[model samples]
Target: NDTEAPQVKSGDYVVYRGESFEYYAEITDNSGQVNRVVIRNVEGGANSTYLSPNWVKYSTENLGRPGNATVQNPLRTRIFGEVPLNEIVNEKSYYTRYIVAWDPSGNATQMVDNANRNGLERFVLTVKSQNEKYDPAESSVTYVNNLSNLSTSEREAVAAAVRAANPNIPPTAKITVSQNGTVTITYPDKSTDTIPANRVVKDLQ
Candidate 1:
């Protein structure tokens, strides 16, 4: 029911509250054909209350409970990796969205999640999407083309979730960009998340 895609353009923040997956752009740029990318750490706390999604919360319904997602907001449970150039390398494009669900078994069948097939009640997952590109060959979509925008609080929450999920990934990172549009994001743990795409556009809608 939530049409929010998990895909995101460089610099366009997607606050996903769903459980969906899509192929983003690869970090490599055919040597000559490249795009611009930038990374700004938006979740570090200066005057903000911080909470990571990696930790489980305690409640009456979930007292002393240990699960992946929070009770009030399930989307804050995981930070899925994104391929920045999902618009360029791929041939088709669709809206970016996220889906959140629970499976006693992590396997999802096509018959599930379909509103027409299951008619919503049997649908255990919610989908959130941003209309940028599902799998585009040309990576020229502006940030305004999609709808995964997040509030400052939501952004911080997801950052916390990332650390909670991956104990190895550091809480912070140093980011770098090349003129040819290559993006190299070096985290505090020395790990990297690269984005190879055109210069970040201002709109995705």
Candidate 2:
């Protein structure tokens, strides 16, 4: 009888207005027997009252059933789901207070406790105004330049390196490498980061 609950590795989440935001977590079981996984908002948590109606209760069972739930890795069962575009609201927030994974023996581990506990392992949906031009406080970018002297493949490799270094950057952000070996990353909120060539070359080494 398995008594150990699956461990949930927390991941980052942030969404801007008019764009879908993805939430993900890595789940692992002692016996490698995860039976189910659920991602939902707490009933009484902060922002619970303003829950987006389009926020789907993502789960493994609901996979490929016309919902947002998606599993990126079959072996590890990395849970991923997107908040629909309609569910995104400007200046409104959403909370994913519960991310539970159950083992075959019914043992479960949750990201956040249900009663009177917050931010322990919760994921906050920071919804910014669509018209807002300023970057969010947490917004950041990795700039790389000096790729103008390198081949096309070399520049792409540098960009890839930058991305690997900054795993926290949102996927929606745009990264453009110019012929001048300058790399500019434009975030969803219009924030930009320009990385110089020397830094890029050093990173590649």
Candidate 3:
């Protein structure tokens, strides 16, 4: 006669690409035991897809006794293992639709309700592609003093200082000295590093 369902104590809201999806729940029944808990459905992707194999059923063998009710707090489980790299598609979002738990008496509870479905217990997995490059043009710099009037040799020295600090930056990377002593290094991948004014001015002094 346990009609109440398990409550989602806490669950994952957002997961990045190549990360595992995890959730937690609490099950309490009038019968005092839960028989099964499962991630009934997860829907997401570019095509708004949900595959049957994605259903996750938690093993309750460890719960107090077989065919009996038990109280649980914060039962934790992971789904999808790890979000595959290929699944990342830049800002795509996914969410879980159903999480169900049943008591030994066959009374079931649906954890996600109409009021809290998408707002609370929903698991949102956002996929971001690794190849998405940052915009170098958006890089900013803060200047402490004016040191842009350096001679060609002085500018080269400043570039050397930048290269020394960032050894991984290739020699071909463009280093531009701004009017306010700000040095911006543009890498081949369009990523940028703005050298501190103190560092740039230090080299010229």
Candidate 4:
């Protein structure tokens, strides 16, 4: 490897107890009427922690298929994270760690880092990604289409595909931002979860 200063930001190098070789994992799902989210720094609790805006980068990988992914296991890992300044979420961190709102998919929301709560009060976290998300129904769908070159029909087709792919999504989700910058999300059924901060430090061991 070049090992020299590359264009890529080193925020990835700062993950909890990460190795350049280990594949980090971040999973999000809005199931059981639960519209919550979380920023799991890695595959296991070894590095999972409540996140804030203190970390460096935030990213998500397409596992290509739904299944368990190991972080450092000898088995091949499909998921990985990218480092970018845009990954800095928790926009309201300085003023307030979290944001309370009943977020509909049609609006732009400023969320916390990693939050998952239930009941009426919701949590909204922040973070950005370079890749197009597979879950177009949730946030980050814009990146997937990338506003790239596509005929109106093609674009509409993709948009329709996204709407149709709402397998794990909810009709309405309540969200909240945490004081520590974590995002707590609640679904229609009161199921909740969250996404931690970008590169929010976690000790893998």
Candidate 5:
């Protein structure tokens, strides 16, 4: 009789900004029967319960086989959704996710990627802003995360570039930073600039 929780064999990975990726797991038990697997996020004041138990694989063996063996890697499925752009900060924000497995006997276990020291998987979905409006909070974070790499002088140059693009922009105008370091600001009147964060950061150096 299996008395312990199911064990996970593979976990942990990252997805590009607003991209979709797949998660695969091999779960098994040493005692009774493998039950189901669950996945959830544990960051940014997230929610669960309704997702307390979402599984791609369920126990069709122990339930129908009458008497059988444990299990193997039973599922490889896409984690669907438009991955949200993570909030920017001086330090990268971590989004930790848990993949759990259970046994019919009420025993359960969380999947850990051994490559990640057998710990909860952490992923950073890069933040990309496009045609976004003025947001002081988001702009500040983007500055720290993507533009901080620029030198102080270079940083000032970036400001100069923004000011140069248009003599005036709405106080509430929003800015977006591309992965390659392009910074574009859109105005209340719907005008935008071509200030590239990468260019400023590199050129001033």
Candidate 6:
């Protein structure tokens, strides 16, 4: 039951900060005896500490609809992960390892490059990706649809004010007036915040 970790899929060569991305792998068992698929991120060493900003545990039941996905192995299962900026760092490299443990006899297999726990697939954090995100928000449903009524300077003023209020916003972050008459701001970390449109005038001061 030496189920190897499946290949990781990615369009970008590297991961960027302030963005959300997904990674997944497929697993199958001829005996239909697979119990669970477990995944973790860490720098392998004597101090194998959990390295995510948040702690998460994945198993066989995480994804896939029973009799829903048409695959060679109706028994095929997928392991998935959604990583956010806070979960990874720009300074370190980490391994995304998985183990497919089987049942009946409890035999298991792991995804590893060498005999060690750190070899599987590698994700290197190079930089941050929060270049820009600007959208709309409104104080009420009545005003949400009328953002263009305001002049360009008016919109820019409100956005600038909101950005000023949040000094820590990343350089790549963006601020804009939403269709709802509110201000919508997206941070370099890919997190979002909204300001009520009624408050926009007040915030401008």
The per-candidate count of clashes, in order, stands at 54, 9, 6, 38, 6, 8
Residues 48-162, candidate 1: write the lDDT tens digits: 2232222212111221223422322221222233323222212222222222122223221111223343221121112223222122122232232322453444334333433
Residue 120's C-alpha lDDT in candidate 5? 30
Order candidates by lDDT, high to low.
2, 3, 6, 5, 4, 1
The whole-model C-alpha lDDT of candidate 3 against the native structure comes to 0.48
lDDT (Cα) of model 2: 0.52
Per residue, candidate 6 scores C-alpha lDDT tens digits across 130-193 of: 4322333332222122454665666776677666656656667777775445666766575566
Model 2, 1-205: lDDT tens digits are 7676666555545555544444455555666556666556567543232334454334353332221222344323333344444444546565555566666667766445443333323555455433332222322233433333566766677677767776666677776666555667776655466776555563332
Which portions of model 4 miss their true places by more than 4 Å?
Answer: 1-168, 199-205
List CA RMSD, all candidates. Answer: 22.9, 11.4, 8.4, 23.8, 12.5, 10.7
lDDT of 3 by residue, 1-205 (tens): 4466554443444443434445444445566666665554444532333433243323333454443434434443334444454552435545455545566666555444354555333444344432222223322323222364565655666666555665544556688765445677765433456655564474324
Q: What is the lDDT of candidate 6?
A: 0.45
lDDT of candidate 5 over 64-155, digit per residue (tens): 12122255434322344443434342323344455555566766564343336333322223223322322322122123334445445444
lDDT of 4: 0.28
Tens-digit per-residue lDDT, 1-205, candidate 4 = 2121101101121221111123332222111011122333322342243444444223333322333222222112122343332333232122112211111121211232443421111222223221112132333222222222334543344434434444444445444433332334454434345544221111222
Top TM-score model: 3
Q: Quick one: best lDDT, which candidate?
A: 2
TM-scores vs. true structure, each candidate: 0.18, 0.44, 0.48, 0.17, 0.40, 0.39
User: Which sections of candidate 2 miss by over 4 Å?
Assistant: 44-53, 56-94, 114-121, 131-205
Where does model 6 exceed 4 Å of error?
Answer: 1-20, 41-57, 62-71, 74-93, 114-128, 131-172, 175-187, 190-205
On the 0 to 100 scale, the lDDT of residue 116 in model 4 is 42
Error of 6 at 94 (Å): 3.5
